[PDB]
A paper describes a structure:
In vivo it exists mainly as a holoenzyme composed of two catalytic (α and/or α′) and a dimer of regulatory (β) subunits, but it can also be found as the isolated subunits. Hence, [name] has been recognised as a highly promising target for anti-cancer therapies.
Modelling studies indicated that 1 contains the right vectors to grow into the Tyr channel by substitutions on the 2-position of ring A. The compounds tested so far were not able to effectively inhibit the protein activity as ATP was not displaced. Indeed, most of the co-crystal structures featured a molecule of ATP/ADP in the ATP binding site as well as the ligands bound in the αD pocket.
Author numbering:
A (entry chain B), B (entry chain A): 4 to 327
C-alpha cells in the first residue's frame, strides 16, 4: 500500500522531545481517593464506571471515572494525553489521578459537566446552535491536532454539552493517540457509525483527518435528523452504508490511489452504487436545519480520500460559520 | 481600626455577577505556544521571564511572559483581570494565553511595545512630555478603577513608553486585585519606593487611591530628577523617608483618624519632622520641569490620608493638564 502523511501538523511530534509523546516511560503520580466522596453513578462503558463526586477538601463537584484495569499502556496513554491537553479549548480538564487505597483501582478525576441529553438536544437545537456547537468541537480538534493528537473516537456521546451555560467538552480520550508521520495504527478504533473509510478498508497510515470524517457523520445526523447517518450493522456493512451515499466509483478510485487490498468478504455485499446528491436527504422534518452552506461543508468533510477532507482549521473558515 | 471605602467606583464589583470577579472559578483556555517563535529575553521579574517573540501565523512581533509556576490563584487572577481590561485605554493588550506542549509552562502573550529606556527618557523628557505621559497613565488608571481593579504595582518599570510613537502602556497586572468595599488586603504589594503610607502602617482596608500615591511618587521623581523620590532602605525606613518630607504631625493625624496602631519598630526611627515646602526640592538641574501647577498637583497626590488624594478622574481636571 501507498504511504500517506497529514496535510497539517505533520511533524509537530517529531520536533518535540521523547518525554512529550512517550507515554510508556512517563511516571504517573496516583493520589489518594479519600479526598473525594462518591455521590451517584452517571454513566458506564468500555471498561469504566463514571460517578459524580465531591472533593471533601474544597466542597467542589467532580466526576470520578473508575477504570476497569485493562492494558496498563492504555491507561498511561490516556493519562499522558489528558495531561498534555489539560487547559485546551473545550477539552475535558483532568483535575486528579487517584487510587482507592483498598481496591487499588485506578480512577481519573475530571471537572463536572451538567450533560444535556442526546435526545433532548436533538429536539431543541436550532440552526444557530448546530453552527455554534460544531465550531466549539472544531476548536477542540484543531487544538488537539496542533498538539499532535488524534482523538479517534469522535461521536455525540463523547461530547458533553451543558446547553444552559452553552459549554461543550470533548471527553473520552481513552482511544486517543500521538500522530507520528508514516506510522501504522490499529484500525479497530472509533465507534462503528463514526469509523472512517480508511479503518474499514484496513489502511493503517491514517492521520487527524479520521476525526474530520467522524465530525462529518455527526453533522449529517444533526442537519438531516437521521442518527446514525451511516447505519452499519457490522464493520463490513458499515462501508456498504457509506458506498450507498458516496457511490462505489469514488470508493475504487480511493483504494487504487493508495493501492489497498479489499477483503474477499466485501465483493458479495458491496455491489454497485451511484453517488447521491446531498439534497435528496432534505425533508419537512429537517429543512429548517438544512442550508446550501451546510451541504457544501458536509460534502467537504465526508470524502473517501482522507487527504481531500477539510482540516479542522480549514473547516473553521467555511461560510457555514459566518453567522458565528 | 476604623473602616474605610473608596470615594469613587465603590460598589462597581458588588453590582456585577460572580463571573466577572470570581477568578478562582473562571475557566482558562490555554492555546498552543507553537504559533509563537521566541526571539530574545526582555525582562526577568520575581514571577516571570519575559521574551520578545514572532507570531509565525501572521509574522507579528509579540511579547511572551513565561510565568514561573507560583500560586495558581495568582495566574488566574492576572488572566481574569487582563481579560476584563483587554481593550482599555493605555492598558497592555493580552493577545493569547498559551502553554508550551512539552514544559506545560503557562505563558501570557501581549502586544509588543518598543520600550524606551528609563535612563534615556529621564534625560530627554521635557515639561510637556511629563504632562502628556502623566495624563496617559491617568486614562489607564481611571479606566481600571472604573472596572473595579487596583493595579497595586504602579512604578516606572511597569509603564512601557514608546517615545517615537508617543505610546504608553500600563503593564504587569500580576499583583492587581478586584476592589470589594470593606475588604482587607495583603499590604505586601507594590515596590518599596511606591508603597503608600497605608501599606507601611499595615492598614488593610485600602482602595484605588494606593495607585494615586504610587503615581505621585513617579511624578515627584521626574519633576525633581530624584529617583526614587522616597528612598527607603527597608519597609520601616520607607515611612521615615516619607515623614521627612510630609512631616510627622500629619502622619499622626492620619493614624488617629483611622485608629491605626504603629509597630514598636518605628519608635527609635520615626523621630519628629516638619512638613517641607515642595519648592525646597527645586534646583538648577530640575527647575525647567517644575511649575506652581506641578507642585499643586503633586501636593494633592502625596497625602497620607488615602481619602484626601485626588481620584484619577479628579486628577485629569487639574490645571497642570491644561496645556494637554
Ligand atoms: O545614601 P543612601 O540613603 O543609601 O541612598 C542614595 C544612594 O546611596 P548609596 O548607593 O551610596 O547607598 C545614591 O547612590 P548611588 O546609588 O547613585 O550610587 C546616592 O547618590 P550619590 O552616589 O550621587 O551620592 C543618593 O544621594 P544624593 O542623591 O543625595 O547625592 C542617596 O540618596 P538619599 O539622599 O535620598 O538617601
Ligand atoms: N466530565 C463528565 N461530566 C459528566 N459526565 C461524564 C463526564 N465524563 C464522563 N461522563 C459520563 O460517563 C460516560 C462515559 O464516560 P467516558 O469517558 O466516555 O467513558 P467510556 O470510555 O466508558 O465511554 C459519558 O457518556 C458520560 O455520560
Ligand atoms: N508588552 C511589553 N512590551 C515590552 N516589554 C515588556 C512588555 N511586557 C513586559 N516587558 C518587559 O518585561 C519586564 C518584566 O515584565 P512584567 O510584566 O513586569 O513581569 P514581572 O511581574 O515578572 O516583573 C518589563 O519590566 C519589561 O522590560
Ligand atoms: C519616573 O518615571 C516617569 C515619571 C513620569 C512619567 C513617566 C515616567 C516613566 C515611566 C516609564 C518608563 C519606562 N521604564 C520611563 C519613565 Cl521616565
Ligand atoms: Cl524600563
Ligand atoms: Mg505584563
Ligand atoms: Mg514588573
Amino acid at each position: 500500500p501507498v504511504p500517506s502523511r497529514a496535510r497539517v501538523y505533520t511533524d509537530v511530534n517529531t520536533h518535540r522531545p521523547s518525554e512529550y509523546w512517550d507515554y510508556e516511560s512517563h511516571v504517573v503520580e496516583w493520589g489518594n481517593q479519600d479526598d473525594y466522596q462518591l455521590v451517584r453513578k452517571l454513566g458506564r462503558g468500555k471498561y469504566s464506571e463514571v460517578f459524580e463526586a465531591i472533593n471533601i477538601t474544597n466542597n467542589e463537584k467532580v466526576v470520578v471515572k473508575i477504570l476497569k484495569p485493562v492494558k496498563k499502556k492504555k491507561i498511561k496513554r490516556e493519562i499522558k494525553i489528558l495531561e498534555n491537553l489539560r487547559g485546551g479549548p473545550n477539552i475535558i480538564t483532568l483535575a486528579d489521578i487517584v487510587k482507592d487505597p483498598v481496591s487499588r483501582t485506578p480512577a481519573l478525576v475530571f471537572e463536572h459537566v451538567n450533560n444535556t441529553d442526546f435526545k433532548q438536544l436533538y429536539q431543541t437545537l436550532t440552526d444557530y446552535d448546530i453552527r455554534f456547537y460544531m465550531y466549539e468541537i472544531l476548536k477542540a480538534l484543531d487544538y488537539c491536532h496542533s498538539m499532535g493528537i488524534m482523538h479517534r473516537d469522535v461521536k455525540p456521546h463523547n461530547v458533553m454539552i451543558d446547553h444552559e451555560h452553552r459549554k461543550l467538552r470533548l471527553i473520552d480520550w481513552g482511544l486517543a493517540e500521538f500522530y507520528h508521520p508514516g506510522q501504522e495504527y490499529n484500525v479497530r478504533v472509533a465507534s462503528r457509525y463514526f469509523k472512517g473509510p480508511e479503518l474499514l478498508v484496513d489502511y493503517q497510515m491514517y492521520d487527524y483527518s479520521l476525526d474530520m470524517w467522524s465530525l462529518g457523520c455527526m453533522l449529517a445526523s444533526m442537519i438531516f435528523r437521521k442518527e446514525p447517518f451511516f447505519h452499519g450493522h457490522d464493520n463490513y456493512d458499515q462501508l456498504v452504508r457509506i458506498a450507498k451515499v458516496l457511490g462505489t466509483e469514488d470508493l475504487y478510485d480511493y483504494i487504487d490511489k493508495y493501492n489497498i487490498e479489499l477483503d474477499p468478504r466485501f465483493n458479495d455485499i458491496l455491489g454497485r452504487h451511484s453517488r447521491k446528491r446531498w439534497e435528496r436527504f432534505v425533508h419537512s422534518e429537517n429543512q429548517h436545519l438544512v442550508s446550501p452552506e451546510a451541504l457544501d461543508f458536509l460534502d467537504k468533510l465526508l470524502r473517501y480520500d482522507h487527504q481531500s477532507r477539510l482540516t479542522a482549521r480549514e473547516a473553521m473558515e467555511h461560510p457555514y460559520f459566518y453567522t458565528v
